[PDB]
Design a protein around this nucleic acid. Sequence first.
RNA 1: GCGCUGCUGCAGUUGAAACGCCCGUAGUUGGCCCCCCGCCGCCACGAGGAAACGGGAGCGCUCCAGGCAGGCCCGUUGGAC
Lengths: 153, 129, 258, 170, 165
Amino acid sequence: GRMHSKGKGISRSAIPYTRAPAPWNKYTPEDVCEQICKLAKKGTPPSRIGLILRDQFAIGQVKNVTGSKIVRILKAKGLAPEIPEDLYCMIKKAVAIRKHLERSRRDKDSKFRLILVESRIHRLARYYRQARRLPPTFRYKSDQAAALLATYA
Amino acid sequence: VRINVLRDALKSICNAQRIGKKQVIVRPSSKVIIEFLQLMQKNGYISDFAVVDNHRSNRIVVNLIGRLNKAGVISPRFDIPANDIEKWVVNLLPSRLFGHIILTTSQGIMDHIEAQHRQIGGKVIGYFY
Amino acid sequence: MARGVRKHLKRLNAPKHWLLDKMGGIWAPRPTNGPHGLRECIPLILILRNRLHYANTYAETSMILQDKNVLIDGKPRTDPTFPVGFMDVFEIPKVHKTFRVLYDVKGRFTLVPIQSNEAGFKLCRVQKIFLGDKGMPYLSTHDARTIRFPHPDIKTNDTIKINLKTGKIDEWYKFDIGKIVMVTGGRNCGRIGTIQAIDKHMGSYTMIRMKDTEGTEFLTRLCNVFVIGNDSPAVAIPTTKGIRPDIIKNRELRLRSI
Amino acid sequence: RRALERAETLRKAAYEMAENQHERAYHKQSQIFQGRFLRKDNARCLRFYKSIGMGYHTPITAINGTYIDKKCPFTGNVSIRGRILRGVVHSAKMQRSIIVRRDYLHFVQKYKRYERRHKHVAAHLSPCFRVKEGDIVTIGECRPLSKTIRFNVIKVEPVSEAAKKRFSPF
Amino acid sequence: LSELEKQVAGTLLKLEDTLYISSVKEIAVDGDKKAAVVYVPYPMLQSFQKNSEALILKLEKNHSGHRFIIVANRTIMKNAYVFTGKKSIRRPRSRTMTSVYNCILDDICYPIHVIGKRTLYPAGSNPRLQVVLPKAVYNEVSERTKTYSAVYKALTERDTEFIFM
RNA sequence: GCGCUGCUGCAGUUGAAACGCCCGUAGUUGGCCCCCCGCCGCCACGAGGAAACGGGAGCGCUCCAGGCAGGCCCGUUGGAC
Ligand SMILES: [Mg+2]
Ligand SMILES: [Mg+2]
Ligand SMILES: [Mg+2]
Ligand SMILES: [Mg+2]
Ligand SMILES: [Mg+2]
């Protein structure tokens, strides 16, 4: 928590040294691929997909079984969202802030938070416009953000 | 943020040797660190070391034996001419008889004595004595 | 900006290889236009007064020249500022002295005495081929001379032998790998060697790599590479064979002569 | 057949240019004698082109194009001589001209460090090339073509979309 | 097209009661025992990997004289980019030397997963790599460590030694 | 002199001096990894381009500040670099 704050914790995850599957693994590389397919059809983000796989199916890491990551699989199958997930969630949070604010506009901390969130959105959007992951025309506007949320979701 | 890995390594080494320690651990590994340590070892300042692989940010262990009195880096790599080494030697080193100055050249990483022998110049990395 | 051409020459602004004393005077002779340019020539008076020493002043040289006592390429010249250049014939019949003007290893003009058999010609470098009036082929050289109707086999940068009495070409040496040459410009004036390599760059200079008899190798641009035969010189050359000694050996020679 | 098609397009274009009465003058290639266009056979060439000569190749657009430009280095009457340079496109607003940005380094001895400097150089752009901002161009030196122009474009390499501006010495 | 391949192929034809090999390489060891390396083509390494411990045991039991190891043959390219003059061709990272050596090391002891690697830099001795194996398995592999070191040195000039931790 | 203008090489709790705080564009700076191909910087060598001044080889203007002289039996006497 460093970019827009003063904190500095170190809560992370530490993956294992060895990349091989579990000795009790009973899934061919395909079987998961169908599971990813049906989960995605239900509008599940990849992070939740990994959570579901790890908890319900006992798969610590997808890459160790299939050799590839979830989003790459979805793209090969033509199911990955056009808008990346982190950006989409940031835009959700911005919309929620704006709504709460237009209900009542005497709250200044909320405006502070909104400023921070929009700055982060602009930075990430610029990075994605570079690297050709988004159209050059893509631009974020405060007054039309809900529309993009609805269509791009 | 972290920038100069070598500076951190050298500061840690000097800190440990000050209180007469026997082993050190420096976190990020690099080719330049390895060559610096190899030269130090060939000159007889730091004995042996080992590199530990973890896929990311390989760690290193070094064994100390006193002897070392100072070590450092010059952050902006200046381009020393072949005939401009004496001034830097005088400015940086305690004497013209036992210190070592490290340079990076098109012929590789070597000492200032070796570069004087081959009458070539290059860029400066650091020093120890 | 001067309103016209320049007629004077300060002594300090003169070429170094003329070897003129700083305290001789404010002025130095200004060579007149002719076969050779200002920086690739030396005035006649300098040879006749400061070297051979047959005269001690400007006036004596003037009398000697206007009395017709020196022939340049078979023609008497009365101009004290006439320019003398490379591979020129200097004959003084009154004393039976004949010299050919060449370069020493140090990079200065020297007089190599010659014989009667080889004084009826000179070597010229051809550097320009062009069409003149009526489309007639022509050919020019380093000494400001033009010859009409040259052989088609003669190309640029070649070397040409012409009889002094009659400006007619006899034989020609091609510019090719393996031919003895002599350097006439730059840091390597007076060195003699054989061509080993030729490298051209589109739109820029062409560099020639030469090797001396002793194995030394040196480079220079093609604008001052002169061919002097086919593996062996065609004319008599100085006592030394185009070998430049290092400072140490020159100092040893100086001490020996001391 | 291939040759016959080319002459038709070249022959055809000269007649629309004659039907563009809004223009005040008739623009034609100097080298070509106007008169070959009434020859039904294809035994006389209708377009003039040349080679730059520094290892560069003449674009197909120039050879098969139907434009007139006296300052073009391929179909015109100018010659390339001198220095060849590289740069990036900074602006492309004039009719047939662009502004090229050149980047280089300057060393300061007292501080033993460098400074980044840039210059703007204007050039003529022939209709045979398509250029947008950020593209890389090779320019060749020519005679004075105007008050600020002494260079002509001879090669274009495209640059991708939304690519970040970067300091690019060349 | 050599003797060893003939009898090993006959063996393989006996074992079933679909997969073929590329070549066979034999490496010597300090003892009279040697090692035979079988170069499996890349697309079928996993085909020869599922039940290969039995395969190697049976092969050793048929023709004794040297142990058998199964590895894949991978290519190494010597340029990150290739300049055809017009565009650039990028070398895939899988064709680097560092990746290939690591894959070889994993393949030599495929049934047992490596737990760590370390390279030591002695004062005078040439630098050498030492790897770390699971402490559970030992007597199974204690008797085939010299052969592993020899084959790794032969394929890759880098030297090594083995311990358990 | 002066490390009292500080690149080498100052100072910034109390002596003079850290913006009240945050966001942020130009600008500056950016972890680790591929053994060799192309490009930029970098190092070395070289060509090319006036001397005078400065450095510097040799020479007893009686010494010297200087000058390029000079000796007979002179590198082709010299003025190298
Ligand atoms: Mg920040
Ligand atoms: Mg932290
Ligand atoms: Mg002070
Ligand atoms: Mg106070
Ligand atoms: Mg105060």
